Design a protein around this ligand. Structure first.
Ligand SMILES: CN1CCN(C)C1=O
Ligand SMILES: [Cl-]
Length: 147
């Protein structure tokens, strides 16, 4: 029927159908279009008090709750999708990962090297696509597949 992971849904506020992917947490109005050994990705990470290491270059002690970290992630997605901000600008300014200094770029990788939810989401994205909120033991991610 549809590419790996997609299903049909119905909007509560409008009644119009849309499409949702349960591996990447992406959602969109348009019908999805149409595996390699390696992919290249960038990300933006927001940590919280239950993160495996609750600290980062922005903050020596990270105290925000998990629910608060999800609201921040949701707001960044809104501004990227409306075009008010670029994915690379927000990651340089607000990502709790050391890769912030490289506009979020993590380089290329294979199956076996990253935390499993991040890996499954990275390899189900198409080239140029962005994920929704993805959860690991580091925190909450937005993923952009560049190659
Ligand atoms: C093991 N790593 C490095 C960065 N990332 C998202 C991981 O899961
Ligand atoms: Cl592709």
């Amino acid at each position: 029927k549809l590419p790996p992971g997609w299903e049909k849904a119905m909007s509560r506020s409008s009644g119009r159908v849309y499409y949702f992917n349960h591996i990447t947490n992406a959602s969109q109005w348009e019908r999805p279009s149409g595996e390699p050994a390696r992919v290249r990705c960038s990300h933006l990470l927001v940590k919280h008090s239950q993160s495996r290491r609750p600290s980062s270059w922005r903050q020596e002690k990270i105290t925000r709750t998990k629910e608060e970290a999800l609201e921040l992630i949701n707001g960044y997605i809104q501004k990227i999708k409306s075009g008010e901000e670029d994915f690379e600008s927000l990651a340089s300014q607000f990502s709790d990962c050391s890769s912030a200094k490289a506009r979020g770029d993590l380089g290329a990788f294979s199956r076996g090297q990253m935390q499993k939810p991040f890996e499954d989401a990275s390899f189900a994205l198409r080239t140029g696509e962005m994920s929704g909120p993805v959860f690991t033991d580091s925190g909450i991610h937005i993923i952009l597949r560049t190659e």
